[PDB]
Amino acid sequence: STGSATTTPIDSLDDAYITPVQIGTPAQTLNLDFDTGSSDLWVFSSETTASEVDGQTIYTPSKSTTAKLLSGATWSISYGDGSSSSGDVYTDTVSVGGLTVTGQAVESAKKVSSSFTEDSTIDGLLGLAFSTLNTVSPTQQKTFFDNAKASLDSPVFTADLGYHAPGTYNFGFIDTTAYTGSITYTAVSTKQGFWEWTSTGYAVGSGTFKSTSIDGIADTGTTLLYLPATVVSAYWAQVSGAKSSSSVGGYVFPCSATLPSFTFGVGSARIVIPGDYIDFGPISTGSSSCFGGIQSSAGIGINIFGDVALKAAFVVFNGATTPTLGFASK
Ligand SMILES: O=C1CN[C@H]2CCCC[C@H]2N1
Numbered sequence: 553s554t555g556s557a558t559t560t561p562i563d564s565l566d567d568a569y570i571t572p573v574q575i576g577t578p579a580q581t582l583n584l585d586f587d588t589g590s591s592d593l594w595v596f597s598s599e600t601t602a603s604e605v606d607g608q609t610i611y612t613p614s615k616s617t618t619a620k621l622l623s624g625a626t627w628s629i630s631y632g633d634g635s636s637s638s639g640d641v642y643t644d645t646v647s648v649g650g651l652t653v654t655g656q657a658v659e660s661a662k663k664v665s666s667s668f669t670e671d672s673t674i675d676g677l678l679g680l681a682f683s684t685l686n687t688v689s690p691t692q693q694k695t696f697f698d699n700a701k702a703s704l705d706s707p708v709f710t711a712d713l714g715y716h717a718p719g720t721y722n723f724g725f726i727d728t729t730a731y732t733g734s735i736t737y738t739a740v741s742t743k744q745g746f747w748e749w750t751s752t753g754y755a756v757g758s759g760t761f762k763s764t765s766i767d768g769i770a771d772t773g774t775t776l777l778y779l780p781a782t783v784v785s786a787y788w789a790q791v792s793g794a795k796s797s798s799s800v801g802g803y804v805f806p807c808s809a810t811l812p813s814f815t816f817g818v819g820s821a822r823i824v825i826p827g828d829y830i831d832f833g834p835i836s837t838g839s840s841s842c843f844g845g846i847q848s849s850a851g852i853g854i855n856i857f858g859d860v861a862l863k864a865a866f867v868v869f870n871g872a873t874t875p876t877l878g879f880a881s882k
Pocket residue numbers: 589590591628629630631632685686687
């Protein structure tokens with residue numbers, strides 16, 4: 553089997569991407585944030601505290617003839633940005649772009665933190681990291697990809713995110729019309745449960761390529777590119793007036809600037825992020841200070857190749873017995 557679904561930016565800055573997902577019988581379609589940095593599929597639901605729902609579409613398990621309470625199971629997750637959610641668990645039929653899994657754990661939120669309530673465009677998350685990170689207790693549950701894997705034509709999914717435009721998540725096949733050149737594959741460590749790999753270096757604008765190993769994760773659920781402070785300083789030094797602002801929480805730059813590109817290495821290959829992809833717009837409405845798309849990972853504990861980096865490439869998440877990642881230009 554295969555599946556193919558379009559993913560759509562939630563706003564004009566590409567702050568996140570949402571993909572429609574069918575849950576239950578008859579189908580209830582919710583728009584989920586596909587997140588290769590976590591492993592829980594959770595949704596706003598009829599069980600979510602009413603004051604914490606503001607415009608999201610909810611899953612109602614009592615209206616699904618295929619829903620079954622997973623008795624005794626609970627879940628609770630906290631993300632790197634301080635947001636969180638928790639609840640109980642149903643199994644139900646879940647379909648993405650024509651690919652159907654029966655018996656998928658659908659984690660129903662009883663509580664969500666303020667940042668989730670305040671984002672009416674995101675109805676929940678669909679985790680695509682390794683199932684070892686799934687938070688369901690006492691019986692850990694598998695991700696949608698893990699459940700689908702054996703049925704897929706090939707044990708892979710691909711992320712093809714757009715810049716200021718929709719893109720595609722495919723399951724079970726590699727669309728050879730969706731990229732240019734060849735796909736360069738690179739080793740993955742699953743020891744932390746992430747799609748963790750090592751970039752071979754970077755360049756700023758037209759500058760010379762610096763060969764240096766940069767360990768990090770491919771995380772579709774993170775908006776920006778988070779890299780070591782040395783690398784990030786070298787980038788922003790090329791932008792007149794750019795500076796790190798403690799009050800804003802990262803590098804800002806004059807909105808009048810033209811940003812340089814940033815290149816990262818994948819083995820001997822190179823992925824070029826155009827400068828415009830690094831512009832996240834005014835820090836507040838009407839400001840002439842703009843927020844940068846490349847930020848330091850120093851306070852995080854891991855480097856994160858988020859959407860800023862991934863959207864410059866066609867990315868293969870190869871879930872074979874030894875997982876690997878593939879990157880192509882497009
Ligand atoms: O609550 C948790 C459980 N352990 C991890 C799961 C994936 C997201 C990061 C972290 N947060």
